[PDB]
Amino acid sequence: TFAKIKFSAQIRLETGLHIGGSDAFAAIGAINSPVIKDPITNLPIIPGSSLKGKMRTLLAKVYNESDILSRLFGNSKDKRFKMGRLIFRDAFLSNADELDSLGVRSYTEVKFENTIDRITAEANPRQIERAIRNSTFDFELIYEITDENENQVEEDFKVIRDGLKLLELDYLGGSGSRGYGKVAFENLKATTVFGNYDVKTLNELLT
């Protein structure tokens, strides 16, 4: 049978983020590596392609030997799995005012940084724009239930929740091997919208 069961969550940074975007001119003082934002609100974001790729590249290290990642995320060549079983979304910074209620001035910090040669011992400085610590982001993840979907949904959820177990151990962001990660998940509820399929056995697999 048919349903769509989304995965609501607040995503919480415990170190910063860095997700870059199209390169722009840096007028000296200006930051060399600006974070991607929302062009309407001028507010940071995690684009949905940066989570669909980061979770897939993380589960490809776990479920390497391919036929379950391909049915969860998609595979263009295989006829069974073009556009199959998952839809992500952006991450729209829910606590834009709990940051002000915690007391903060601007939503992105500018981490200064450098590079030191091993011959000249000469510096080479960078400025990395970063989404600040303990921001939350409205994360949600549609997982569509269909006819071919049936009888394997039990191993689409010890993988999705084995995937969100991985993002709290790998970085989710650029320059993640120097901090810039440590994404945590909270309020990880699995409701249901447009469907007749209960979720109240799944909701204790997560929480």
Binding site: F25, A27, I28, G29, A30
Partner: protein, 734 residues
């Protein structure tokens, strides 16, 4: 067409005595001088008797003879019913009124320094004309009259007679050169002859000499025009990660220019006309003068339908030629202003109606006929037909001929064969070729690019913006000087004339009562602007380390090393206001880019910079960013030559303050609250007495000046200091 040729030669080559009797000082009327001197190079009574009896004020009672057409084509080729001054520049009656500048009467070359006009060239110089006059005798030395020799004569005028005045003893029609007066005369003459000899009128003494006032208001001229829609979104068909980076942009902008030239060529031989009838060709649009018969209208409709079948055959609704003609009698001569705008309005709205009602029933029923299986596509143009495996990928036909054309683009001659290279017509395929390889192939027409010589095969001279100092990937490494004094970047400037369409629709009707927007001045201004933006950009960019990718019409798109790009924009503006007298402000936008960035992410950011500059004011240069927007009146004088030379004169004398002081200065200029004025007042006064106390007043006259253009409170003298320090830190980066 057996007696059209000598008609063209006579009604063109009359008033060519008007260089002889201006070089020898003879008061004989030109109709006799030119007809006399023409007999001592070639023998033709059908040309010399046309030069002889065109004036109808010395002697006429000997003819009928193709003289009367030769008469009346001269009487419509002036704005009126037609002593030691030169040729007036065109912009004395363009828009505003400034000092009237006048042309030094010289010829034209290829490595020529430009030909700016001043007010101090107003009295004549008869002695200047000799290097002109023998140029007409020798280059036309062994001359004949046929469709081979029909065309290399015309470039023979535009290398020499481009700056020779016409009818010196009058005041109104003044800024029209001989190499447009004669071109319009011979343009009109063939139109009169086609209109008359279509309708079976075989005598001219009673229809063109005494009943000239009645045919003069008979609707006999089709001001035709066309427009090639889809040019800009054909040139910019390139995405990120594209193999042919900018050679496939040079090649595409030359392909569309030769297509828009081959339409204006292959139209007039479907008709009985030549390259004199075309009043202007250029950025898609091209304006002609044809005869007002049905033999031109059905040939126009047939040719437009066949060429659009040709365009649907390979491009599939990416390009579209739209034609349109406005009919008029000989009444654009002074309802004087509302007769010229009207006939240009008619072809404008015919093109606009034809832009919007594209095809007929059968072609669009064909266009989605189906039956077309596919599994691959050309990743460039998303076409299906003729896919091959060029460089381990699938390409189409046109994006294979384009790589062949980008190899051939560095030559001089481009011949139109039937099978080789890029198709630009119905069974006409373009191919670039060297000079010596012309013998083995069999052309039908040949375009020689940016030349003025007589040519081997009596070719057709076309113009293009062309320069290439080095390769695109070498341009960031070339920016480092002979000390390492540069940042390793490469800049891109997309210039643009501001309000070019406002300079062509109204253009001249600002001065006067609608009496100066006429045909001759419009064609002269159009040839002047194409002569600037296609020929003379190579002179301004002769020594520099850049590469003018695309140039002309208004728009210029030039990659290059960044110091040379900025100096090239400076020289182009400081020569375009010398050219167009301060009228026609242009607007550049420069963007600084690292190496190996793609030239689609580069071109779009520079285009956004450029439209931000156009939206800054009517004129602006937007250096490097969407906030460093200036004016050309202010960037060139104050920023680039006043402030930057003062900062270089101060900093390259001392050996104490280094890059750190400049970086903190830019930081205080960029942050900028009011409190930073006090912080800078503390900083400069603290550093004033920290110096070596011998050379302190160097720093004192610098710091008083810097605090003078921090706290000036005009908002126009602060961003200049910030950008001047950006350019200095760029210049001194190791």
């Amino acid at each position: 067409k057996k007696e059209k040729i000598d008609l063209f030669y006579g009604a063109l080559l009359a008033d060519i005595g008007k260089v002889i009797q201006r070089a020898t000082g003879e008061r004989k009327k030109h109709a006799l001088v030119g007809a006399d001197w023409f007999d001592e190079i070639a023998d033709n009574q059908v040309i010399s008797d046309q030069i002889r009896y065109h004036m109808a004020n010395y002697q006429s009672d000997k003819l009928d003879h193709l003289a009367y057409i030769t008469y009346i084509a001269d009487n419509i080729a002036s704005g009126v019913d037609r002593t030691y001054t030169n040729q007036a520049d065109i912009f004395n009656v363009f828009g505003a009124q400034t000092d009237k500048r006048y042309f030094k009467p010289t010829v034209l070359n290829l490595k020529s320094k430009p030909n700016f006009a001043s007010a101090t060239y107003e009295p004549f110089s008869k002695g200047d004309y000799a290097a002109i006059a023998t140029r007409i005798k020798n280059e036309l030395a062994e001359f004949e009259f046929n469709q081979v020799q029909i065309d290399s004569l015309l470039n023979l005028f535009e290398a020499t007679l481009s700056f020779v005045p016409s009818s010196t003893n009058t005041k109104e029609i003044a800024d029209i050169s001989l190499a447009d007066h004669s071109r319009l005369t011979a343009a009109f003459a063939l139109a009169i002859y086609d209109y008359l000899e279509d309708k079976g009128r075989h005598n001219y003494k009673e229809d063109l000499f005494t009943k000239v006032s009645a045919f003069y208001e008979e609707e006999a001229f089709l001001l035709a025009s066309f427009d090639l829609s889809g040019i800009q979104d054909f040139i910019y068909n390139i995405n990120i990660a594209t193999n042919g980076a900018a050679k496939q942009l040079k090649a595409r902008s030359l392909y569309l220019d030769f297509m828009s030239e081959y339409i204006a060529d292959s139209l007039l031989d479907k008709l009985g006309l030549n390259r004199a009838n075309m009043l202007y060709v250029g950025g898609g649009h091209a304006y002609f003068v044809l005869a007002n018969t049905e033999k031109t209208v059905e040939t126009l409709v047939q040719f437009e339908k066949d060429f659009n079948q040709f365009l649907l055959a390979n491009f599939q609704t990416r390009l579209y030629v739209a034609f349109g003609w406005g009919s008029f009698a000989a009444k654009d001569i002074m309802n004087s202003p509302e007769s010229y705008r009207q006939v240009y309005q008619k072809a404008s709205r015919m093109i606009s109606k034809k832009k919007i009602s594209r095809y007929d029933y059968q072609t669009l029923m064909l266009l989605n006929r189906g039956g077309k299986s596919s599994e691959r596509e050309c990743e460039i143009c998303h076409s299906v037909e003729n896919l091959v495996s060029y460089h381990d990928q699938k390409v189409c036909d046109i994006c294979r001929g384009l790589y062949q054309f980008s190899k051939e683009i560095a030559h001089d001659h481009f011949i139109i064969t039937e099978n080789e290279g890029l198709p630009i017509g119905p069974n006409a395929c373009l191919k670039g070729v060297a000079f010596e390889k012309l013998s083995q192939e069999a052309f039908s027409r040949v375009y020689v690019k940016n030349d003025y010589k007589a040519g081997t095969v009596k070719a057709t001279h076309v113009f293009v913006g062309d320069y290439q100092c080095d390769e695109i990937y070498n341009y960031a490494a070339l920016s480092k000087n002979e000390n390492g004094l540069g940042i390793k970047r490469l800049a891109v400037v997309r210039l643009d004339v501001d309000d070019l369409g406002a300079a062509f629709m109204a253009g001249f009707s600002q001065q006067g009562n609608g009496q100066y927007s006429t045909l001759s001045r419009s064609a002269t201004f159009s040839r002047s602007m194409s002569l600037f933006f296609k020929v003379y950009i190579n002179q301004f960019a002769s020594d520099k380390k850049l590469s003018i990718i695309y140039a002309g019409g208004d728009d210029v798109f030039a990659i290059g090393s960044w110091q040379d790009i900025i100096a090239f924009t400076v020289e182009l503006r400081e020569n375009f206001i010398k050219w167009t007298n301060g009228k026609l402000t242009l607007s550049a936008g420069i963007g600084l880019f690292a190496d190996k960035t793609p030239i689609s992410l580069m071109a779009h950011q520079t285009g956004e910079l450029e439209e931000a500059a156009k939206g800054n004011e009517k004129d602006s240069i937007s250096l490097f960013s969407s906030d460093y927007t200036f004016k050309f009146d202010r960037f060139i004088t104050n920023v680039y030559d006043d402030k930057l030379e003062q900062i270089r004169y101060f900093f390259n004398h001392q050996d104490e303050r280094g890059k750190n002081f400049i970086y903190k200065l830019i930081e205080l200029l960029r942050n900028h609250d009011r409190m930073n004025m006090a912080r800078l007042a503390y900083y400069l006064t603290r550093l004033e007495e920290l110096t070596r106390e011998t050379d302190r007043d160097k720093f004192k006259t610098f710091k008083n000046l810097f605090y003078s253009w921090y706290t000036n409170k005009n908002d126009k003298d602060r961003k200049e200091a910030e950008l001047a320090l950006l350019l200095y830190i760029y210049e001194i980066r190791k």
